[PDB]
Amino acid sequence: IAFNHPIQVDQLNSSYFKLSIPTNFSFGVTQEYIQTTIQKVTVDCKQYV
Amino acid sequence: KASKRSGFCGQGTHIVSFVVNAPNGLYFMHVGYYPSNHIEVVSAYGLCDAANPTNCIAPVNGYFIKTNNTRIVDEWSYTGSSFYAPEPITSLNTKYVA
Amino acid sequence: AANPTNCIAPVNGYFIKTNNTRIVDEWSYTGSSFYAPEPITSLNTKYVA
Amino acid sequence: CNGFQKCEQLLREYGQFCSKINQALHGANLRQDDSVRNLFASVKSSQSSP
Amino acid sequence: DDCMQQICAQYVAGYKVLPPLMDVNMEAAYTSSLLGSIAGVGWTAGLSSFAAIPFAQSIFYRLNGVGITQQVLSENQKLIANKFNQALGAM
Fold first, then answer.
1. Nearest CA in chain B to D44
2. Distance from the A18 Cα atom to the nearest Cα atom in chain E, whole angstroms
3. What subunits touch chain C, counting only 3 or more CB pairs under 8 A?
4. Cβ contact B68:B75 at 8 Å
């Protein structure tokens, strides 16, 4: 079992609030293909049969 | 075109996206910022003043750690101009907006 | 050096030579002073560029 | 059909169609499971502050 | 075991029901983590970076965003929190 267990910040009763800050740019990701179109084909009926 | 906003691109901040021809379709290459390391820093929720103008959160928290520090990067101050910060009416817990 | 600074503000306003604060139909207009906010100084000599 | 040898032999002739049915159901379930994982991925990485 | 003592799908054999592949407790843990995150996420421009924000403050900040109520008006309109509880009760 290796699931969930996410990082959790602690809520502060005091007016000042602890905030997690990013330190590394780590730019870059990939994106899924969206299909967009389907193949076109024509069948010659009454001849192929 | 822009996304710079909520968009179909997901799992990362949409700084930019790229389109390439794909067989029977279109292929996308969005770019996403990843924080990687998070450091928890105590932040004031705005600072009030004896004068009516008061420090307030604008691009990011007005005080990242103390006084006026505004940045999303590791360095809290980052030479912030503070021009962006608005000046709202004094609120509860005086001398602080909080 | 002074805190007030000219800014592009909407669509690339404050153009070089005559300032193109006017946009679309109007080619150029004298700066209103409410048209552009003061931005933080940016890398270059004497300009945001 | 199970428990009848004659029925099983006829089903063997139609076995290829039965194999396609099993493969199609397995593929649909895997695609659905991937979609469920994608939904829970967005929920994952959230911080339970309180 | 209960069916032998007396679902019936296994005895029929016909079709076999398939488990969802995600445990209910794991899904519940994800929803609870999301509930914690939304209070932090719903803050002025702080969004995800802002954290440890109170649930009451997050509701007030969200209300100010969608509807431009005056800060004085929000203080004047007391029992808004009670009305939110009434809405939860009505559901």
1. B11
2. 6
3. B
4. no
